[PDB]
From a paper:
By using a flavin transferase and carving a flavinylation motif in target proteins, we demonstrate that “dissociable” flavoproteins can be turned into covalent flavoproteins. Specifically, four different flavin mononucleotide-containing proteins were engineered to undergo covalent flavinylation: a light-oxygen-voltage domain protein, a mini singlet oxygen generator, a nitroreductase, and an old yellow enzyme-type ene reductase. The elucidated crystal structures confirm that the covalent attachment does not significantly perturb the binding and microenvironment of the redox active part of the flavin cofactor.
The six preceding residues of the motif were subsequently chosen by established rational protein engineering considerations such as to minimize the structural change at a position, e.g., retaining a glycine at position 65 when compatible with the motif, mutating to an alanine whenever in doubt (e.g., D62A, not D62ILVF), and minimizing hydrophobic exposure at the surface (e.g., Q63S, not Q63T, which would introduce a water-exposed hydrophobic methyl group). This resulted in two [name]-[name] variants, each with six point mutations, which are further referred to as [name]-[name]-F1 (D60D + R61A + D62A + Q63S + L64G + G65A + R66T) and [name]-[name]-F2 (L64D + G65G + R66A + A67S + R68G + I69A + R70T). To gain insight into the structural consequences of the covalent tethering and the introduced mutations, we determined the crystal structure of [name]-[name]-F1. Residues 61–63 are in a loop, and residues 64–66 are part of an α-helix similar to other [name] domain proteins. The isoalloxazine and ribityl moieties of FMN have the same interactions with the protein side chains. The phosphate atom, however, has a different position, 1.9 Å away toward Thr66, to which it is covalently attached, by a changed angle of C4′–C5′–O5′. From the interactions with guanidino groups of Arg54, Arg61, Arg66, and Arg77 in wild-type [name]-[name], only Arg54 and Arg70 are retained due to the mutations. Variant F1 displays the fastest dark recovery, accelerating from almost 1 day (1150 min) for wild-type [name]-[name] to about 5 min in the case of [name]-[name]-F1. Interestingly, [name]-[name]-F1 and -F2, both containing covalent FMN, exhibited a quantum yield 3.5 times and 2 times higher than that of the wild-type [name] protein, respectively. The effect was largest for [name]-[name]-F1, which displayed an apparent melting temperature (Tm) that was 10.5 °C higher when compared with that of the wild-type [name] protein.
Author numbering:
A (entry chain B), B (entry chain A): 1 to 135
Write the structure that this text describes.
Amino acid sequence: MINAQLLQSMVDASNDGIVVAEKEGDDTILIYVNAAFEYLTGYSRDEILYQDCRFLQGDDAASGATARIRKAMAEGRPCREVLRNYRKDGSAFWNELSITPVKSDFDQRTYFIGIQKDVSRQVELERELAELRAR
Amino acid sequence: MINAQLLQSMVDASNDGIVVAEKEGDDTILIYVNAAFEYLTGYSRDEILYQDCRFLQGDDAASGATARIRKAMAEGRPCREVLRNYRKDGSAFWNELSITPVKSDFDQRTYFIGIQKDVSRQVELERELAELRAR
Ligand code: NI
């Protein structure tokens, strides 16, 4: 079996962003982010934490597309969505987000694990590909 | 701050494969794999563990990266390599593998963290693109 420090290093090594949020009312707030999430978003740890992750969505709220996510979180189901998000510097990316409910023995709190991934390149590739297929 | 159970949930939730290996002679053997690594490779934990991970490489001896990885592991450097691997069922996939040395302050032994990303899709998209551009 594997100890806590190794688990930390497994998260720290990970390519995808990983985060944990605890529920605060009908919102969540980030309590942990890994290094890859910092790099992905352009924000430092200290800028990100203790806030709901929707700030990444920017000043726009899409069409409250997060409907599916809020449905799933409320219901205690995982989900995955691709969302528009914006780095610190304003540059936009497509973020493939997988959210996973956690059941906590230790306290009474509700936690969620998020795994996040830049999929811009792949979105663009599918687009370029469909364009050439159309020629 | 973050506890051990949630770290385990972060690794369990991970989309990429995560694994820990030990040195044994001039081999390394897996001692932990997450669920995603099962899915990725098609093998169960009990089939995988306690073996050097090169069996995934199949009948296809690469050279190139293997040397590079041995070099890097010996030297105690993290390293990253793309390599063809084969699931249980024979189907091939492109694995972006990053290996990270860590020393356990618990038992003073050095452990290797492996992160495995399936990058088949991107690779195939670039392939399909380069083919249509060739038309
Ligand atoms: Ni042995």
